[PDB]
Every structure is written in C-alpha cells, then in structure tokens.
C-alpha cells in the first residue's frame, strides 16, 4: 500500500530507460557494435525483469501472501532467477568482449554465439524450478529450498562474478611519440644505409627507444637484426628492418585501438561496480542466514531485494553520463 505505488514508479522508470537504450542502439549506426549488442541484450534482460517478474514481487510486498497457484509461483520464480542469471552472465560476456577488443583488436558469429550461450546457460540453471522442485508452502512464494539457494548462489553469482573480476583484472593489467619518431628515422637510416656500422648504430638507437614502448617482440626482433650487423650482413639486416617497420606500425595501430576502447571499458567497469554494489547485501545476508543461523528479519531481505532491483534502472543513466553517442541518440530520439 505504501511501497506499492513507489515501486510501481520504479518499474515504469526501468521499462522506459531500457526501451530507450534499445531504440537508441537500434536506429543509430554509430552505436552498432558488438559490445553494444551485448549491452542491448542486457537491457532486454532488465526489461524482462521489470515487466514479467517485478509486478508479482510488488504484489507480495503489498499483500504478504501469495494467493495464486503453486505453478504460477514456480514459473515466475523461474523467470526471476533466469533473468538475473542472464544479467550477470551478460556482464561476464561484456567483460570478455572488452578483453578481446583491447588485447586482440584484430565477426558477428562470436557475438551471436555468446548471446545464445548466455541465455541457454541461464535457462539451464533455472530449469529445475518449473519442474516442481520448488516446494513452496501454501500462500507463500519463495525459493523454498536452501540447497537450491546454495547452488544458485554458486553457479549464478559467485562463478560469473569471480570470472568477470579476473577478466577485468587482466584488462587493468593492460596499461611515446618521440619514440616512434626515433624508430622511423632510424628505419629510414637503415633503408638508405650501405654499410654495417650505420645499421648497427641505428638498431642500437632503435632498441634504446623501443624499451619505453614494450614490456617484448619488437625488442627481440631488434636483437636478431643486431646480431646480423656484427657479422656484416647488411641486406639481411635491411630485410629484418623492413619487417621491424611492420611490427612498429602494428604497435601504433594496437595502442590506438586501445585508446579508443578504454572509455567504453571504463563505463562498463563502473556499470559492473554498481551492479555488484546493488546485489552484494542480498547474498551477504543469504550467507549469513545459511552459515550463521542468524535470525534475519524479512525487512532486510525485502530491502536488499529492492536494493538489487534498483540496479535495473541505473544502467541507462551510466550510458547517458559516460558515453557521447549514447547521449546524442537519446536527445535525438526524444525529439
């Protein structure tokens, strides 16, 4: 009666924001990329949460007694668990796509595969509930099995969260103009060179300048080219220098793609952070209830349920604040 209208407003906000995200990516071609495709899948998941599941949760928050059939409750609890598992696995897939884009910038079949895998795995995880394994008592609607609570926390939350944290750690691991100028100048010096001393000196300066860029394949190739010059093999050193130019251009392209993608990476990182912040107290109280025998009041359960549901509305705000083309598409579709 009190929270009834308030969470109705939250449901409407979630629906509007996610429909907005979906349309903005659907019509504007600046946003039509694979990672944004995964983002739209996540938005569809949140929309399904707000539309199909949240009304019945509001009904239970209002009347306090599930006054419908056991199959009704089983089906909609199945939908709840499946959509939330889909959300977290979509976040994991987005982390994986960001790692792929940053590490290996070198195509839609993979996107279709990941989207289908996310939904297939979520439906597989949530299957047991529709088969009557949820034995809820009369006029109550919960996950009535603690063992299934543990299994769902393990496969639906802990594994995807840990894998996503590790992938984003790998991404954070991945973190010079005068150096490129020096490299190219010494490359052309080797190209116009006619003896071995000039090539040796130029490759020495190239190795000195290439330490700042690498960690390194470029340095090893420079060392191989450098062995050639002590033996006086000028033509072989020049061929190695031509392949070195290829490697240097590849480095330039890679660190340009990386600088382009870092901003979207940061936006998705803060999205993941907000998701974890919203959904952490729920599982914290669950683990307390299980491994403590803590007499936890249901008010905390409902409060943390809704704290985790709030995350279904903050993703469009993050897309608006931390992205340019998304905000442009928003303002344009509004008029």
């Amino acid at each position, epitope marked *: 009666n009190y929270y009834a209208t308030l969470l109705t407003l939250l449901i409407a906000v979630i629906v509007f924001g996610n429909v907005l995200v979906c349309m903005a990516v659907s019509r504007e071609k600046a946003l039509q990329t694979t990672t944004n495709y995964l983002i739209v899948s996540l938005a569809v998941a949140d929309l399904l949460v707000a539309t199909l599941v949240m009304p019945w949760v509001v009904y239970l928050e209002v009347v306090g007694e599930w006054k419908f059939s056991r199959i009704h409750c089983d089906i909609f609890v199945t939908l709840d668990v499946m959509m939330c598992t889909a959300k977290i696995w979509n976040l994991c897939a987005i982390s994986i796509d960001r790692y792929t884009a940053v590490a290996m910038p070198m195509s839609k079949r993979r996107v279709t595969v990941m989207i289908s895998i996310v939904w297939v795995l979520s439906f597989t995880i949530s299957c047991p509930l529709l088969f009557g394994l949820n034995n809820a*008592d*009369q006029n109550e609607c*919960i996950i009535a099995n*603690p063992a299934f609570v543990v299994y769902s926390s393990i496969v639906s939350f802990y594994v995807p969260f840990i894998v996503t944290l590790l992938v984003y750690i790998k991404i954070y691991i991945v973190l010079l103009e005068d150096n490129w100028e020096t490299l190219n100048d010494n490359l052309k010096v080797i190209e116009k060179a006619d003896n071995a001393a000039q090539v040796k000196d130029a490759l020495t300066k190239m190795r000195a300048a290439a330490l700042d860029a690498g960690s390194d394949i470029l340095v090893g190739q420079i060392d191989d080219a450098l062995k050639l010059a002590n033996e006086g093999k000028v033509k072989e050193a020049q061929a190695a220098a031509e392949q070195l130019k290829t490697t240097i251009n590849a480095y330039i392209q890679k660190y340009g793609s990386q600088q382009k993608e870092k901003k979207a990476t940061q936006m998705l990182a803060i999205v993941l952070g907000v998701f974890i912040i919203c959904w952490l107290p729920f599982f914290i109280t669950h683990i307390l*209830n299980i491994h403590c*025998d803590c007499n*936890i009041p249901p008010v905390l359960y409902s409060a943390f349920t809704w704290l985790g549901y709030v995350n279904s509305a903050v993703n469009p705000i993050i897309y608006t604040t931390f992205n340019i083309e998304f905000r442009k598409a928003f303002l344009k579709i509004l008029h």
Partner: antibody
Amino acid sequence: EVQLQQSGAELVKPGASVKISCKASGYSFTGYNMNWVKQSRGKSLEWIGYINPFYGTTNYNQRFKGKATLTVDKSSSTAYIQLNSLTSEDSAVYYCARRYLTGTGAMDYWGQGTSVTVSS
Amino acid sequence: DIVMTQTTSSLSASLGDRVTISCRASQDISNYLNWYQQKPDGTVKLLLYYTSRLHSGVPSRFSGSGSGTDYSLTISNLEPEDIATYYCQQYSKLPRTFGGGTKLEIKR
C-alpha cells in the same frame, strides 16, 4: 529420529503474555515450516498459523493476528509462540507441528502439547 | 473459512468391526482433506493425506474416500489401539480448518 518437545504447562494471570517453546530434533530445522495449532477445552482444533524457519516469514490465520507471534531460533533450532493479552478464551492446549513436505497442507509430526490456563 | 462438520461426536463400535467416520465440508474442497488421530494421552498422529494416501507407518486397516463435500475414513477391523479421536482437516483454502472430532468407544 524426529522429536518435537514443547515447554511445560503455563498458569498465567489474565491480561499478561506467555511464550511457549517447541524444540525439534532429527532433521534439518530450517527446511520444514513449523505450524502452531490450538485445541480448546471443547476438543476442537484451530490452525493458529505457520512460520518458515529459513526466511522467518509467517502466515497467520486472520483470527489469531495480533494474538499470536511466531518466532524461531535457528541456533537452538526451536520455534516459539507468544500469546499476548490473555483472556479466558485463550486457555487451551497448544501444539507445534511439522509441515509434511509430501502432503500439501498436512502436518506429519506433532508435539506433546502445552496447556495454558488463564485465571486470576 | 470452510467449516468442517463431523456428523457424530461419539461413536460406539464392537472390536474387530468396520468403522466409518463421515466428514462434511461446507463447500467443495475438491478432495483436499487429511485425517489425524489423537490418543487419550493427547498425542496426535497423521494418518491420511489427499483423502486416500496412507502416511508412513500406519496400518492398512485405514482407508479414506470421498468427493465434493462428503468424505469418510474407514477402519476395516477395529483393534484396541484404534480407540481414539479422529479429526478431519481441509486444506483447500486458507485458513486450514478442522472437524469437530469423532471419538471412538468400545461397544459392550
């Protein structure tokens, strides 16, 4: 081997409150919902309500709302019923019982009962 | 509030006889009914659920039947251990309600 042992009999003055306990042994306490049932002097039975021990959630007979308060202690694996504002009509025997999972709406294992006598 | 009615509060039966205890629901409870037993020492035992399904550890002398609003428990042969009060309970809708109870006496 399952056993539900309830507290001793109560002799309470009218208006006061009382708290009966029901300690379970022989199964996972947090899985089976605990029902509480009244039996008046007239030998007739009434479903007071039930509590889900896992989530602490309760479902009451609308007739007993505000008269009964169901609580659990997972540590001691013990259910409790508290009756407030006791009148003569409240003196009866009170049973705890365990939700029969196989049979919907059935209680398979009952306690030995607790007499409550309201008298000044 | 489905009121359960047990036709006879008291009922006398000779030993080793066929006893039948009726139980009329105030509406169609659609065979959502259970039968409990309470011995003189107050101990309560679950005998039948779903109007015909024997609980674990109860003998085959007991059998339930019924439909619509009319249901019945039946003891094929009466043993002395079966002298007790039998209660029928409906779970078709909350709140769960019980019958008035039918207590058994030995005919002599």
